């Protein structure tokens, strides 16, 4: 078992509609806690979970530091879109997308179990940091342009230092500062509804984390409720497994 600190960047070009757009979000487990969007006027990193409204108390420079980082990252990936377009011999007329996901999985006791830094171009793997955090794997021939650059520049060492150090440390800080949000295990509110045509529908509402097992069929994808939790339904007994349930529940109409 573990917890994770995970960041997601999307940069995409919009030829004819100004500069590329850059959006960054951060999560701890299934809770989003920070965002940045380059299309805002004077864009800043902004809190999106309750404990981040307090981080300024113990870390008064948090928002300036991460706003500066994100503004710089937006400018870098603007040029990155041009570079990668060139590696693929693509025209300037089309819109293209770079995505990045990076972060750390941390088990009990605070030890790094896995660090990662993966990039995609136009929805497909482009380059990734190897599990040893010391070298890179290009997913195709065009991406070897980036792999050669990053190998010679020594960027794996900088990623390694973040993933083994800062990432783990920040995950632990957020877990404790955000305990009431992150360390909760809220069980689903469960009930069966009845619609003759007869459809039985087993509901699971308001649960956290997202992982759940619903069994009786039509099983909808788990969906956010908009308040920081999740919903699912399946449509005789219905059985529900969730981390927040001491034992698997059984329901019938």
């Amino acid at each position: 078992g573990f917890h994770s600190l995970r960041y997601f960047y999307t940069a995409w070009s919009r030829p004819g509609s100004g500069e590329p757009r850059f959006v960054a979000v951060g999560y701890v487990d299934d809770t989003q806690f920070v965002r940045f969007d380059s299309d805002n006027a004077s864009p800043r990193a902004e809190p999106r979970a309750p404990w981040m409204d307090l981080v300024e108390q113990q870390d008064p420079q948090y928002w300036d530091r991460n706003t500066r980082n994100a503004r710089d990252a937006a400018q870098t990936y603007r040029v990155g879109l041009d570079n990668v377009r060139g590696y693929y011999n693509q025209s300037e007329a089309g819109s293209h997308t770079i995505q990045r996901m990076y972060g750390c999985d941390v088990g009990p006791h605070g030890r790094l179990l896995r660090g990662y830094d993966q990039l995609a171009y136009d929805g497909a793997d482009y380059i990734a940091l190897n599990e040893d955090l010391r070298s890179w794997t290009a997913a195709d021939l065009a991406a070897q342009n980036t792999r050669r650059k990053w190998e010679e520049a020594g960027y794996a060492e900088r990623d390694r230092a973040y993933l083994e150090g800062e990432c783990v440390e920040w995950l632990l800080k957020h877990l404790e500062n955000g305990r009431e949000t992150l360390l909760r295990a809220d069980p689903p509110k469960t009930h069966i509804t009845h619609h003759p045509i007869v459809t039985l529908r087993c509901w699971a509402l308001g649960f956290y984390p997202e992982e759940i097992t619903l069994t009786w069929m039509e099983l909808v994808e788990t969906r956010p409720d908009g308040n920081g939790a999740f919903q699912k339904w399946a449509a005789y007994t219905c059985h529900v497994q969730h981390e927040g349930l001491p034992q698997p529940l059984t329901l019938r109409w």
């Binding site: 990252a73 990936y77 040029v79 990045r100 650059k149 990053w150 960027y155 973040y162």
Partner: peptide, 8 residues
């Protein structure tokens, strides 16, 4: 904090 960003 966000990590470093590297130019592709």
């Amino acid at each position: 904090d966000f990590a470093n960003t590297f130019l592709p």
